[PDB]
Design a protein around this ligand. Structure first.
Ligand code: UDP
Ligand SMILES: OC[C@H]1O[C@@H](O[C@H]2[C@H](O)[C@@H](O)[C@H](O)O[C@@H]2CO)[C@H](O)[C@@H](O)[C@H]1O
Ligand code: MN
Length: 287
């Protein structure tokens, strides 16, 4: 009972892509009416869930910062449930959560190669969606732990299936995108194809859609393994292959996952989430 024109105005940001050829909106600062959305949603008594993994030193290095900022900026004004996946619960920080925030922690198995830790998330999120998340929330977001919220990340980002535009390529042409280019991988995307380059650090939608996103990405990750090949950018490559075949119903602008190392060009008006500086030497133990 909600139409796009009710809360989305592409004309507010005329200098940037605000609509896809499949009529899906790309939410940029200034184009959305959060107040109209907060009311509409408050009446449906929606609950928004957020999953975040932290295995190894990713725990001590980023979990607290992520959770403290999520608590303060994520879906404010609505019930939110944080789903924390760690390999060692003893090192999990218990920050104080505010109104309408609550959480739960699960201990998971730590995979050997950081590449599998990142890729296994797909299998695990799905298991939890079927087991419980599908019964506790209306929309779900799955994010990387190595980032922090800088401002309101609200209901204007909700949708069937939501994708995030990676900050370094939102202006590049598809043939410049770092898609997997080997036809031997399930993630393969031929030159001449592609809409955008999606970032794996943020994606979401209804539990059902996210269940399908992850199941499909994991089938793809498993297949490559049987074929002795590994996607160039792992799950992101698979995710991009997936969002190609199944266009997202909503796309978030780089303002929702920005990397300050790029600086801050005219297009990024109000950063809502920023990348943590990479510390691979400390947080990773391989390759
Ligand atoms: O040893 C590891 C490798 C990855 N991750 C998780 O997987 C996500 C994606 O990985 P990473 O941050 O290494 O990806 P990048 O954005 O740097 O490609 C991270 O945010 C973490 O939540 C983790 O917990 N432990
Ligand atoms: O290629 C996808 C890959 O990008 C990494 O970020 C790169 C960026 O692509 C590159 O153009 C720039 O020069 O350096 C960045 C590294 O700081 C992401 O970190 C990775 O997660 C993928 O999204
Ligand atoms: Mn990351």
């Amino acid at each position: 009972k909600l139409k796009l024109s009710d809360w989305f105005n592409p004309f507010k940001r005329p200098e940037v892509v605000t609509m896809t050829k499949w009529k899906a909106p790309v939410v940029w600062e200034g184009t959305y009416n959060r107040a109209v959305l907060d009311n509409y949603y408050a009446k449906q008594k929606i609950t928004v869930g957020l999953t975040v993994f932290a295995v190894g030193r990713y725990i001590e290095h980023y979990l607290e910062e992520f959770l403290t900022s999520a608590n303060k900026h994520f879906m404010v004004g609505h019930p939110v449930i944080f789903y924390i996946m760690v390999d060692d619960v003893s090192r999990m920080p218990l920050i104080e959560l505010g109104p309408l925030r609550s959480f739960k922690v699960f201990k998971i198995k730590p995979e050997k190669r950081w590449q599998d830790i990142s890729m296994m998330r797909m299998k695990t999120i799905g298991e939890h969606i079927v087991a419980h998340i599908q019964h506790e929330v209306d929309f779900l977001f799955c994010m990387d732990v190595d980032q922090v919220f800088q401002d309101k990340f609200g209901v204007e980002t909700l949708g069937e299936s939501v994708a995030q535009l990676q900050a370094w390529w939102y202006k590049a042409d598809p043939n410049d995108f770092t898609y997997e280019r080997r036809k031997e991988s399930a993630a393969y995307i031929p030159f001449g194809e592609g809409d955008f380059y999606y970032h794996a650090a943020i994606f979401g939608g209804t539990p059902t859609q996210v269940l399908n996103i992850t199941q499909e990405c994991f089938k793809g990750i498993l297949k490559d393994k049987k074929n002795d090949i590994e996607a160039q950018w792992h799950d992101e490559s698979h995710l991009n292959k997936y969002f190609l075949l199944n266009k997202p119903t909503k796309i978030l602008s780089p303002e929702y996952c920005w990397d300050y190392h790029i600086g801050l060009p005219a297009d990024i008006k109000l950063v809502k989430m920023s990348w943590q500086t990479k510390e691979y030497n400390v947080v990773r133990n391989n390759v």
